[PDB]
Amino acid sequence: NTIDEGLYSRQLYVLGHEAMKQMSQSNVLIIGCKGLGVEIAKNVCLAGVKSVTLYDPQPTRIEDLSSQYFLTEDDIGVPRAKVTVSKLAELNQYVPVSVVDELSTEYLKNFKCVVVTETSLTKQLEINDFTHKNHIAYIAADSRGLFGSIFCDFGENFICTDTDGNEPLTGMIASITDDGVVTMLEETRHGLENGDFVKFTEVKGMPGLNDGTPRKVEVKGPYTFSIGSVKDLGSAGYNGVFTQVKVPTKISFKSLRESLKDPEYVYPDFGKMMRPPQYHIAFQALSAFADAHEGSLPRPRNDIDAAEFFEFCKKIASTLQFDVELDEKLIKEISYQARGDLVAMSAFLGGAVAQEVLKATTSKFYPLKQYFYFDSLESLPSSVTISEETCKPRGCRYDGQIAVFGSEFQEKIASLSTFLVGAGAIGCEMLKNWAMMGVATGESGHISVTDMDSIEKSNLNRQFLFRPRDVGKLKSECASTAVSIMNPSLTGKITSYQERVGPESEGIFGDEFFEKLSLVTNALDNVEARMYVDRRCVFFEKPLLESGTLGTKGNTQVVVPHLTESYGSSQDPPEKSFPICTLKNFPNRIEHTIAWARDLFEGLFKQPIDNVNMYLSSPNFLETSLKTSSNPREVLENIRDYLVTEKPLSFEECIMWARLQFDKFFNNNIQQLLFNFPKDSVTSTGQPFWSGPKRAPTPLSFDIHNREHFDFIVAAASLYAFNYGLKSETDPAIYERVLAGYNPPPFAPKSLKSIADSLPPPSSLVGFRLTPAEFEKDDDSNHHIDFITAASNLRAMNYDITPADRFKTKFVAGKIVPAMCTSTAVVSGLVCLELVKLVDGKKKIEEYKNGFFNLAIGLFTFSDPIASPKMKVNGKEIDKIWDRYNLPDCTLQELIDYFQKEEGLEVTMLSSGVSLLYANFQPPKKLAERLPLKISELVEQITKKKLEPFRKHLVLEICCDDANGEDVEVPFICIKL
Amino acid sequence: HHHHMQIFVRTLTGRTITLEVESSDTIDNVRARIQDREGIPPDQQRLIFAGRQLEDGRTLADYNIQRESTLHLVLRLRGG
Amino acid sequence: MALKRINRELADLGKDPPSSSSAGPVGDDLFHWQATIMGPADSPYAGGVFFLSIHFPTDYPFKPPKVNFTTRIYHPNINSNGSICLDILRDQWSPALTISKVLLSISSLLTDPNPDDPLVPEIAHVYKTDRSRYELSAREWTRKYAIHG
Ligand SMILES: Nc1ncnc2c1ncn2[C@@H]1O[C@H](COP(=O)(O)OP(=O)(O)OP(=O)(O)O)[C@@H](O)[C@H]1O
Ligand SMILES: [Mg+2]
Ligand SMILES: [Mg+2]
């Protein structure tokens, strides 16, 4: 029914209202409540399905705590599902959670989707046989050490209404030959693919295409493509617009039983194309092995079990006619790691499976079809002894991780000292992963987490360490407390900060702070902070684990000192922007009018206000602004208009003012534009001016009966009132009464000192200030989004552009980033699979992995990090990124001499931050007062600011010329003050 | 020696770009073509084949890129 | 490098033949430059000296610089805010281009306005229908704001 947008906001921008409605009517059953099952349950509970039912009568064992963060040592011996239920129930008040002690086939009909973990193949076959023929979605997954599997069967006639979540393709047409050869406008890519369906609109030449009947596309070029002979109607069309149509798709899934012999694989790594077939055999062998040992799996690093396990692999391989050789070393690892229970693997598979559950209950996004086999084998430690002896259980909560990494490695993890920047979505999952792993629980271990943000309602949907009662509290503090509960050993081992990592906090996070860190982990939502942290890690030579998400997408990057390039070493696409000329007078997309509207919001309820408060604040605002602003008149008129000319006394005067704005921005300006450029206008080339991107606009005649016109008056009037502290009203009657008596001032397309002195002296208004509107996208009652939506849609009407509703405008204007628990969980798992490589001190760059994925289409891909660039300086090989000169605080002259004398190079450029300290092209007079100065002194003077008392170093960038005048790259310089 | 082959470049959004190339082509050339087809600047192109990020100065052959080989064009995300 | 590239361009500006326009760091800030463009002799801007502000992005030259006019000017593609509609500043930008190239582009736009891609429709309209009226206004505006005090 009505979705709680306040709680689901970011997730709604990923799934959509319709998908979430179907979700709310879907019950889900989850078999298995160990690490994997609880992670799946957690994400499904946060997502908002109808209800979650758990089944797992197995008693809690100490090893289960290696990944099941809702179980405690006091629960040992108690059925897992029973212990877990109340914890999951607390996640989403909208999702009831319960336990069933027994299952029956007919009982399965109560669910839209059945998830099964920790279950033998024979039991799976029985379960799936029934679900497959009873229209019940089935998903099975298991976590086995550094190996994982996921199998999906959504029935033989599953319908998918959206296979990728991508917006439909659209573009402008130039001409359409009778043969069907369509051509986009000058330098315009249609982005279509063969097989896609597109309809048309505004096509001039064949009114038939504007019908709405989608046709098949036949791409011919990035600018041209064929749709078919359109000779029947029209000989040639032009100035049209195509729009892709996303037609539903039937996906036929085979049952588990019928696909065991010939499984369809989804490959997470194209560099390991040969493994899925090997793993398919292995996971079946584990189940056959368990059957011969009363459900027990092979023991950690136990050779006898692995040999028996390998025999099952041979038999199974033969039975399904596997014409490929079994990789004995690879396969036996699955036996050796069978009991391995890693929280990173549960996060990775758990988040991915949860997304599949949502695909089954919504018909949105392409499901995994059908077998997903994964490994992160490179995560296996090599700097420690991995044996039956080191991997054997110790009756410890980390036994699940020890089974894979050993007890020796357990100590390296426990002694880690970490820095987590950001306690949001990625932050919470990471903190939970660290807690289950035993990170920093050792004597020399520690965790420092910082974030300046406080908990908000929409955060709860994917920041599971927080609860509704925590809203308004600091994220870092709450998260720290939450994980101390998940793992008591972390009590007193965590320090939370409320600092924004960056330049202003270098006093707290300085040299001493960094020196003791083992590694830094980013969990940020902006590139600026990422670049800053990266720079600092390069300076302090500390490893950096980086990650990001966007909807169902995500990525991870690892930066290793003296081995890989750093985060800032590569380029990313720029943030979305639009041509200034397009926004000002020629919009053609709803994004263009929403940007225009945001600026209008600022230019009416913010910028003018600050000017009025600055005129009543500073002593010489007029004096300064007279030569500090790029348009003195605007600042003047703002003071005048907002203090006298247009100052409202009652709300009715606000309504009157709002009515005037309507004509100013949606009528008069449009008339003036049409006057300046008549609809019949032509270019200097002879072509019609108003074609393609330029859409001939139409002025709007105000009418209170048009909803958008009305919304604008209500929003604008209410915002204006906010500026003057006047109480606003919403009773439609008041507006009608006021608007009715409005006398539209005469308008016709036209073909400073006094304004200042006529202003009341600042001292004649001391104590009186206006309240500027501060853009806040998440408060639906402040009229902000209402104003931008209305303003944008009216301009949309002016240019004949399809309007967007408040929900969409809020997303565009508010720059909201699509997000959900699923992808958040997945990146955390991948990041922690890399973290263990750092702690093992791996030196080979190919052992590391940068990951990328899009859960909406079942796409995962990995690549080795890029080696840092090397270079030679006087024979010696230098690391362009990590190597640096460590010199004392000598004077400029001295530093120049050092390079000439030692490196035999001529210092041509020296800089500190963005400031140029020295250049071999500066005037002798200038260099005269600088050369004698010490670097520190030189910086303080040039930057016109004094260093801080905590400042212990200075970073400088330098450029040098080879003795032959040529240029030679050189590492940066660290000045030890 | 070298020879002709058809390769596929799939992006993170799921889109699939088909390319006709010669195993002798340099990674630099491929980036140039992708820029023409998609308008994406080479400096922003992160191409991966069989677990390796392709670097300039090498040829498709250097990465053992076969006929019908699929590569990935990915991006880094900033939320989370 | 980003800062080193801006420096290479700075150093190369002094190695170039005496040009009309001028540009360089503000207060030794390699990312915030001030430039001057002489009003072209063959235009109603002759005699005027036009100041511009230049902000280089952290990822320059992969991303174009933000160029803004700080001197008022009566022109079809430049508004009261200093904003400019010029191809090279957006979609026609590549790491190969430089500030010198940009300044020359801005100088060329001055002698040859582009009325078909108007930022200020009112001015472009005059340029198109009454060129002499535009030149008078352009010359007058140059006299009132581009001669400096
Ligand atoms: N420079 C910084 N130093 C420390 N933490 C930061 C910095 N910049 C951002 N963050 C934090 O990183 C986290 C980003 O996580 P996320 O995007 O999930 O949360 P959010 O910003 O609260 O959510 P939303 O974008 O939906 O409003 C936030 O908690 C944010 O305050
Ligand atoms: Mg927030
Ligand atoms: Mg955020």
PDB file of N, CA, C and O in Angstrom, chain A residues 452-484:
ATOM      1  N   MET A 452      31.412  12.801  11.261  1.00  0.00           N
ATOM      2  CA  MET A 452      30.833  13.990  11.879  1.00  0.00           C
ATOM      3  C   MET A 452      29.308  14.005  11.791  1.00  0.00           C
ATOM      4  O   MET A 452      28.660  14.884  12.336  1.00  0.00           O
ATOM      5  N   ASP A 453      28.745  13.014  11.114  1.00  0.00           N
ATOM      6  CA  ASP A 453      27.309  12.940  10.896  1.00  0.00           C
ATOM      7  C   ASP A 453      26.502  12.302  12.020  1.00  0.00           C
ATOM      8  O   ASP A 453      27.025  11.542  12.838  1.00  0.00           O
ATOM      9  N   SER A 454      25.214  12.630  12.050  1.00  0.00           N
ATOM     10  CA  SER A 454      24.299  12.076  13.036  1.00  0.00           C
ATOM     11  C   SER A 454      23.287  11.195  12.303  1.00  0.00           C
ATOM     12  O   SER A 454      23.025  11.390  11.118  1.00  0.00           O
ATOM     13  N   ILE A 455      22.731  10.227  13.019  1.00  0.00           N
ATOM     14  CA  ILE A 455      21.773   9.280  12.461  1.00  0.00           C
ATOM     15  C   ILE A 455      20.444   9.889  12.027  1.00  0.00           C
ATOM     16  O   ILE A 455      19.808  10.631  12.771  1.00  0.00           O
ATOM     17  N   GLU A 456      20.036   9.577  10.805  1.00  0.00           N
ATOM     18  CA  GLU A 456      18.772  10.056  10.266  1.00  0.00           C
ATOM     19  C   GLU A 456      17.883   8.858   9.948  1.00  0.00           C
ATOM     20  O   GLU A 456      18.367   7.734   9.779  1.00  0.00           O
ATOM     21  N   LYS A 457      16.580   9.106   9.858  1.00  0.00           N
ATOM     22  CA  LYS A 457      15.609   8.053   9.591  1.00  0.00           C
ATOM     23  C   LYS A 457      15.895   7.214   8.336  1.00  0.00           C
ATOM     24  O   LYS A 457      15.870   5.989   8.402  1.00  0.00           O
ATOM     25  N   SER A 458      16.175   7.857   7.206  1.00  0.00           N
ATOM     26  CA  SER A 458      16.441   7.106   5.984  1.00  0.00           C
ATOM     27  C   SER A 458      17.723   6.275   6.027  1.00  0.00           C
ATOM     28  O   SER A 458      17.929   5.413   5.167  1.00  0.00           O
ATOM     29  N   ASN A 459      18.582   6.525   7.014  1.00  0.00           N
ATOM     30  CA  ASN A 459      19.833   5.771   7.151  1.00  0.00           C
ATOM     31  C   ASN A 459      19.552   4.368   7.658  1.00  0.00           C
ATOM     32  O   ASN A 459      20.262   3.424   7.318  1.00  0.00           O
ATOM     33  N   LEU A 460      18.522   4.241   8.489  1.00  0.00           N
ATOM     34  CA  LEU A 460      18.159   2.959   9.089  1.00  0.00           C
ATOM     35  C   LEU A 460      17.934   1.829   8.101  1.00  0.00           C
ATOM     36  O   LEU A 460      18.164   0.662   8.429  1.00  0.00           O
ATOM     37  N   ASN A 461      17.485   2.165   6.896  1.00  0.00           N
ATOM     38  CA  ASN A 461      17.227   1.161   5.866  1.00  0.00           C
ATOM     39  C   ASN A 461      18.471   0.378   5.435  1.00  0.00           C
ATOM     40  O   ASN A 461      18.346  -0.718   4.913  1.00  0.00           O
ATOM     41  N   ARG A 462      19.664   0.926   5.656  1.00  0.00           N
ATOM     42  CA  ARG A 462      20.891   0.224   5.249  1.00  0.00           C
ATOM     43  C   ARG A 462      22.095   0.394   6.185  1.00  0.00           C
ATOM     44  O   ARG A 462      23.224   0.076   5.815  1.00  0.00           O
ATOM     45  N   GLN A 463      21.844   0.910   7.382  1.00  0.00           N
ATOM     46  CA  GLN A 463      22.875   1.120   8.402  1.00  0.00           C
ATOM     47  C   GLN A 463      22.309   0.387   9.617  1.00  0.00           C
ATOM     48  O   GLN A 463      21.863   0.989  10.594  1.00  0.00           O
ATOM     49  N   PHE A 464      22.330  -0.940   9.513  1.00  0.00           N
ATOM     50  CA  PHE A 464      21.750  -1.844  10.501  1.00  0.00           C
ATOM     51  C   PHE A 464      22.242  -1.821  11.927  1.00  0.00           C
ATOM     52  O   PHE A 464      21.705  -2.545  12.767  1.00  0.00           O
ATOM     53  N   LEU A 465      23.261  -1.019  12.222  1.00  0.00           N
ATOM     54  CA  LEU A 465      23.728  -0.954  13.601  1.00  0.00           C
ATOM     55  C   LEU A 465      22.914   0.092  14.337  1.00  0.00           C
ATOM     56  O   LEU A 465      22.966   0.165  15.556  1.00  0.00           O
ATOM     57  N   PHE A 466      22.162   0.901  13.596  1.00  0.00           N
ATOM     58  CA  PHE A 466      21.343   1.946  14.210  1.00  0.00           C
ATOM     59  C   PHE A 466      19.872   1.551  14.317  1.00  0.00           C
ATOM     60  O   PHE A 466      19.377   0.733  13.545  1.00  0.00           O
ATOM     61  N   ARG A 467      19.183   2.153  15.279  1.00  0.00           N
ATOM     62  CA  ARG A 467      17.771   1.894  15.491  1.00  0.00           C
ATOM     63  C   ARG A 467      16.997   3.208  15.526  1.00  0.00           C
ATOM     64  O   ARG A 467      17.571   4.273  15.750  1.00  0.00           O
ATOM     65  N   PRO A 468      15.676   3.148  15.304  1.00  0.00           N
ATOM     66  CA  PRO A 468      14.841   4.357  15.316  1.00  0.00           C
ATOM     67  C   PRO A 468      15.091   5.247  16.540  1.00  0.00           C
ATOM     68  O   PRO A 468      15.059   6.476  16.444  1.00  0.00           O
ATOM     69  N   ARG A 469      15.338   4.629  17.690  1.00  0.00           N
ATOM     70  CA  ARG A 469      15.585   5.396  18.905  1.00  0.00           C
ATOM     71  C   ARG A 469      16.928   6.114  18.883  1.00  0.00           C
ATOM     72  O   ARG A 469      17.163   7.018  19.690  1.00  0.00           O
ATOM     73  N   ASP A 470      17.809   5.717  17.967  1.00  0.00           N
ATOM     74  CA  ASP A 470      19.127   6.343  17.876  1.00  0.00           C
ATOM     75  C   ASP A 470      19.131   7.554  16.970  1.00  0.00           C
ATOM     76  O   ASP A 470      20.129   8.254  16.891  1.00  0.00           O
ATOM     77  N   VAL A 471      18.032   7.797  16.268  1.00  0.00           N
ATOM     78  CA  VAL A 471      17.977   8.954  15.387  1.00  0.00           C
ATOM     79  C   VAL A 471      18.385  10.191  16.183  1.00  0.00           C
ATOM     80  O   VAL A 471      17.976  10.364  17.331  1.00  0.00           O
ATOM     81  N   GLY A 472      19.204  11.041  15.572  1.00  0.00           N
ATOM     82  CA  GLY A 472      19.653  12.242  16.249  1.00  0.00           C
ATOM     83  C   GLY A 472      20.969  12.038  16.972  1.00  0.00           C
ATOM     84  O   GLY A 472      21.577  12.998  17.427  1.00  0.00           O
ATOM     85  N   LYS A 473      21.422  10.797  17.088  1.00  0.00           N
ATOM     86  CA  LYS A 473      22.685  10.533  17.763  1.00  0.00           C
ATOM     87  C   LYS A 473      23.833  10.424  16.765  1.00  0.00           C
ATOM     88  O   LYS A 473      23.614  10.268  15.561  1.00  0.00           O
ATOM     89  N   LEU A 474      25.057  10.509  17.271  1.00  0.00           N
ATOM     90  CA  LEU A 474      26.248  10.419  16.436  1.00  0.00           C
ATOM     91  C   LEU A 474      26.454   8.995  15.955  1.00  0.00           C
ATOM     92  O   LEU A 474      26.435   8.053  16.749  1.00  0.00           O
ATOM     93  N   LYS A 475      26.659   8.848  14.649  1.00  0.00           N
ATOM     94  CA  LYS A 475      26.873   7.541  14.036  1.00  0.00           C
ATOM     95  C   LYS A 475      28.044   6.786  14.629  1.00  0.00           C
ATOM     96  O   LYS A 475      27.897   5.641  15.050  1.00  0.00           O
ATOM     97  N   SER A 476      29.212   7.423  14.651  1.00  0.00           N
ATOM     98  CA  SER A 476      30.409   6.764  15.166  1.00  0.00           C
ATOM     99  C   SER A 476      30.224   6.204  16.573  1.00  0.00           C
ATOM    100  O   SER A 476      30.562   5.047  16.831  1.00  0.00           O
ATOM    101  N   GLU A 477      29.682   7.012  17.479  1.00  0.00           N
ATOM    102  CA  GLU A 477      29.457   6.558  18.852  1.00  0.00           C
ATOM    103  C   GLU A 477      28.518   5.359  18.931  1.00  0.00           C
ATOM    104  O   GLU A 477      28.825   4.378  19.603  1.00  0.00           O
ATOM    105  N   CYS A 478      27.373   5.439  18.257  1.00  0.00           N
ATOM    106  CA  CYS A 478      26.413   4.337  18.274  1.00  0.00           C
ATOM    107  C   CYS A 478      26.985   3.060  17.684  1.00  0.00           C
ATOM    108  O   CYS A 478      26.804   1.976  18.245  1.00  0.00           O
ATOM    109  N   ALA A 479      27.669   3.187  16.550  1.00  0.00           N
ATOM    110  CA  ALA A 479      28.250   2.020  15.887  1.00  0.00           C
ATOM    111  C   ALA A 479      29.263   1.338  16.793  1.00  0.00           C
ATOM    112  O   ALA A 479      29.283   0.112  16.903  1.00  0.00           O
ATOM    113  N   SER A 480      30.099   2.134  17.453  1.00  0.00           N
ATOM    114  CA  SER A 480      31.108   1.577  18.353  1.00  0.00           C
ATOM    115  C   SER A 480      30.443   0.765  19.454  1.00  0.00           C
ATOM    116  O   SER A 480      30.866  -0.348  19.768  1.00  0.00           O
ATOM    117  N   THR A 481      29.392   1.325  20.031  1.00  0.00           N
ATOM    118  CA  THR A 481      28.671   0.646  21.089  1.00  0.00           C
ATOM    119  C   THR A 481      28.040  -0.631  20.561  1.00  0.00           C
ATOM    120  O   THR A 481      28.091  -1.671  21.210  1.00  0.00           O
ATOM    121  N   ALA A 482      27.446  -0.548  19.376  1.00  0.00           N
ATOM    122  CA  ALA A 482      26.789  -1.710  18.786  1.00  0.00           C
ATOM    123  C   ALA A 482      27.727  -2.892  18.586  1.00  0.00           C
ATOM    124  O   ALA A 482      27.369  -4.016  18.912  1.00  0.00           O
ATOM    125  N   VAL A 483      28.928  -2.658  18.065  1.00  0.00           N
ATOM    126  CA  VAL A 483      29.843  -3.776  17.852  1.00  0.00           C
ATOM    127  C   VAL A 483      30.472  -4.313  19.126  1.00  0.00           C
ATOM    128  O   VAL A 483      30.933  -5.452  19.151  1.00  0.00           O
ATOM    129  N   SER A 484      30.499  -3.506  20.182  1.00  0.00           N
ATOM    130  CA  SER A 484      31.057  -3.977  21.452  1.00  0.00           C
ATOM    131  C   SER A 484      30.103  -5.044  21.994  1.00  0.00           C
ATOM    132  O   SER A 484      30.507  -5.957  22.718  1.00  0.00           O
TER     133      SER A 484
END
